[PDB]
């Protein structure tokens, strides 16, 4: 399909912009650290887990204002930044009616080491419908009839002390941008 190729082309360009002169050695060094604790680690299986588990659960919690779920999936400083806006909305008794339409083009962009552990940076595209309403049912944020096409970049960090490999990754950072006219 033509459209499918264009969206795939956009993802590849983002991966290029995230690939500096030292990206090959930095990725290899991060894999060395991950492999020390999880010898069976595989990049493709990891990306499958991101698409079927990590992304859907975290993104849903974010747009639905589910603070307890979000706190379990994020690092401390990360949670504080995401929580504040949600906490303000709840104080005004606002309602989160946002929903996810689709998620695709999941890919591995780069790797880096941080104090909390090894980091793998992924990207993906998603179609969302954002809408927040007040107690009266009136829309005070977003647009219930508009579909937003987003390009996300997520930094996931691994807890090197976690016994179970399928529960070792948590959200460390996130950036994004709409893809209108692309």
From Swiss-Prot:
It is found in: Mitochondrion inner membrane; Mitochondrion matrix. Coiled coil: none annotated. Belongs to the Tim44 family. Essential component of the PAM complex, a complex required for the translocation of transit peptide-containing proteins from the inner membrane into the mitochondrial matrix in an ATP-dependent manner. Recruits mitochondrial HSP70 to drive protein translocation into the matrix using ATP as an energy source. Probable component of the PAM complex at least composed of a mitochondrial HSP70 protein, GRPEL1 or GRPEL2, TIMM44, TIMM16/PAM16 and TIMM14/DNAJC19. The complex interacts with the TIMM23 component of the TIM23 complex. Interacts with SLC25A4/ANT1 and SLC25A5/ANT2; leading to inhibit the presequence translocase TIMM23, thereby promoting stabilization of PINK1. This is Mitochondrial import inner membrane translocase subunit TIM44. It comes from Homo sapiens (Human). The lineage of its organism: Eukaryota, Metazoa, Chordata, Craniata, Vertebrata.
């Amino acid at each position: 399909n033509a459209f499918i190729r264009a969206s795939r082309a956009l993802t590849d360009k983002v991966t290029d912009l995230l690939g500096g002169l030292f990206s090959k050695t930095e990725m290899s060094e991060v894999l060395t650290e991950i492999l020390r604790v999880d010898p069976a680690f595989d990049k493709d299986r990891f990306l499958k887990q991101c698409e079927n588990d990590i992304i859907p659960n975290v993104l849903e919690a974010m747009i639905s204002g589910e603070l307890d779920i979000l706190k379990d999936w994020c690092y401390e400083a990360t949670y504080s930044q995401l929580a504040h806006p949600i906490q303000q909305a709840k104080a005004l008794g606002l309602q989160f009616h946002s929903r996810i339409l689709d998620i695709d083009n999941v890919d591995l962009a780069m790797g880096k080491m941080v104090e909390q552990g090894p980091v793998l940076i992924i990207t993906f595209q998603a179609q969302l419908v954002m809408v927040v309403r007040n107690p009266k049912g009136e829309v005070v944020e977003g647009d219930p009839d508009k579909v937003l096409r987003m390009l996300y970049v997520w930094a996931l960090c691994r807890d090197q002390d976690e016994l179970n490999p399928y529960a070792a990754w948590r959200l460390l950072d996130i950036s994004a941008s709409s893809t209108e006219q692309i």
